[PDB]
Design a protein around this ligand. Structure first.
Ligand SMILES: Nc1ncnc2c1ncn2[C@@H]1O[C@H](COP(=O)(O)OP(=O)(O)OP(=O)(O)O)[C@@H](O)[C@H]1O
Ligand SMILES: [Mg+2]
Lengths: 428, 25
């Protein structure tokens, strides 16, 4: 039960085709008629879209006839289901549009909720919808270092959504390249957290948020288009933050948030907790609740690690329809200056500080490293505050010749800059 | 035969002053 031919499918108005591709599953979709969207991004008719290693809905705004090709699906297996909660997304979107249009500046919204309530899907959809009717450029702010969006994992980020997302990509789209592309790409501001979970170093996590908030403010001050559009701030699971929600307080202050969106039932203890804690600061009129979003499903860590791997590959080499050429170089041990953040595992208590790394295969082989703008000779306090230039991958550490093979996204020389060891590993 | 690559990111000061209309126009 496989097959490599095209198959016709009609999706009813208001239904999702729920797709779940696992690993090496490859799906091609071609729309014949109607309107379908992937997290608010409209598929063009007669154009082929290719998907891989992703779990996502294709939503029918109108009754849609399409053609699909995939050896790992059959007509008797595909899942099509009515979605009853889109109206909540529309109501919220058009309220926000009203603020972008009439208020002195655009709304700055934080989205909060439990594990897999649909915070990131809501964010993506609202960003897509913001482009559609009045050509806004909202800032998408990702505060979940486990979700790779426009960059590699381990980062928080701010990115203006200045043109359509790539409906093919779980990563939403890509950052700028040196050549010609089918879609206009994005220009993100990225801060390196570097660790696998925020509880490995809460202090450093909050440090990154403060650094992002400062440069986000500098952008909004200089950019009237983005300022009028506002910000969509996406957070990690609420269960990952502290009991008293003091991390949310910090996010709200550093990013100048004025609207809060909570994903939960009016009877979840979270609802009253949020009103009691943030109501005196934001005003209860500016705290909204969305019930369960339909279709949203739980993900395991196998699935999260799979999106992370794909995002690392994409950073260096591009995607299926955007082939990029990264650059491999050999360097000596003496050519590299590498630091490592404090963490609970290595240092028992995570602080805002870095320690020097001694070059070993066990330490560095297969590691993603952040490249800063700081001199090699820069002190630790300078390196901590230094903006991120990009990322590199150490594919081989030869102990006997005292040399490394390093992969760069940009062809040319190894940057003469201070670098920071990440917890992420990638084998080609 | 022609090739392209990923770009480095912009510094804080260059990103703050950057206009996405440069990308899209
Ligand atoms: N209508 C739908 N049908 C099928 N799958 C969906 C639908 N909406 C969202 N999903 C999928 O459900 C999964 C969980 O959604 P999402 O990642 O947005 O939740 P989240 O609250 O951000 O999760 P986390 O707490 O892990 O950050 C994702 O894989 C997403 O693509
Ligand atoms: Mg999420």
């Amino acid at each position: 039960t496989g097959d490599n031919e095209w198959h016709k499918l009609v999706i009813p108005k208001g239904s999702d085709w729920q797709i779940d591709l696992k690993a090496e599953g490859k799906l091609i979709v071609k729309v014949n008629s109607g309107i379908v969207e992937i997290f608010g991004t409209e598929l063009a008719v007669d154009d082929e879209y290719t998907f891989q290693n992703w779990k996502f809905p294709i939503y029918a705004v109108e009754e849609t006839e399409l053609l699909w090709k995939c050896p790992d699906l059959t007509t008797n297996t595909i899942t099509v289901k009515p979605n009853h909660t889109m109206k909540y997304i529309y109501n919220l979107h058009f309220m926000l549009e009203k603020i972008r249009m009439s208020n002195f500046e655009g709304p700055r919204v934080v989205i909060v909720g439990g594990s897999q309530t649909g915070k990131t899907s809501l964010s993506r959809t609202l960003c897509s919808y913001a482009l559609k009717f009045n050509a806004y450029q909202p800032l998408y702010i990702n505060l979940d270092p486990q979700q790779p969006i426009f960059t590699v994992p381990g980062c928080i980020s701010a990115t203006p959504i200045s043109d359509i997302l790539d409906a093919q990509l779980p990563t939403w789209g890509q950052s700028l390249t040196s050549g010609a592309t089918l879609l206009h790409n994005k220009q993100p501001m990225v801060k390196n957290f570097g660790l696998e979970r925020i509880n490995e170093n809460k202090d450093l996590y909050l440090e990154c948020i403060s650094q992002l908030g400062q440069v986000v403010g500098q952008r909004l001050h200089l950019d009237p288009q983005v300022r009028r559009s506002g910000c969509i701030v996406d957070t990690p699971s609420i269960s990952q933050l502290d009991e008293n929600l003091a991390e949310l307080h910090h996010i709200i202050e550093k990013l100048n948030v004025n609207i809060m969106l909570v994903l939960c039932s009016e009877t979840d203890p979270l609802w009253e907790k949020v009103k009691k804690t943030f109501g005196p600061e934001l005003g209860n009129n500016n705290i909204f609740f969305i019930p369960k979003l339909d279709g949203v499903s739980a993900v395991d860590d196998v699935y999260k690690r799979s999106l992370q791997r794909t995002s690392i590959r994409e950073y260096f080499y591009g995607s299926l329809d955007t082939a990029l050429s990264p650059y491999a170089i050999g360097v000596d041990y003496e050519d590299l200056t590498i630091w490592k953040p404090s963490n609970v595992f290595d240092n028992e208590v995570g602080r805002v500080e870095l320690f020097p790394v001694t070059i070993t295969p066990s330490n560095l082989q297969h590691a993603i490293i952040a490249i800063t703008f700081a001199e090699r000779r820069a002190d630790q306090a300078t390196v901590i505050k230094s903006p991120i230039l990009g990322f590199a991958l150490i594919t081989e550490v030869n102990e006997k010749r005292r040399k490394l093979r390093v992969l760069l996204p940009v062809p040319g020389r190894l940057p003469s800059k201070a670098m920071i060891l990440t917890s992420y590993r990638y084998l080609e | 035969k022609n090739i392209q690559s990923r770009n480095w990111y912009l510094s804080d000061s260059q990103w703050a002053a950057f206009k996405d209309d440069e990308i899209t126009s």
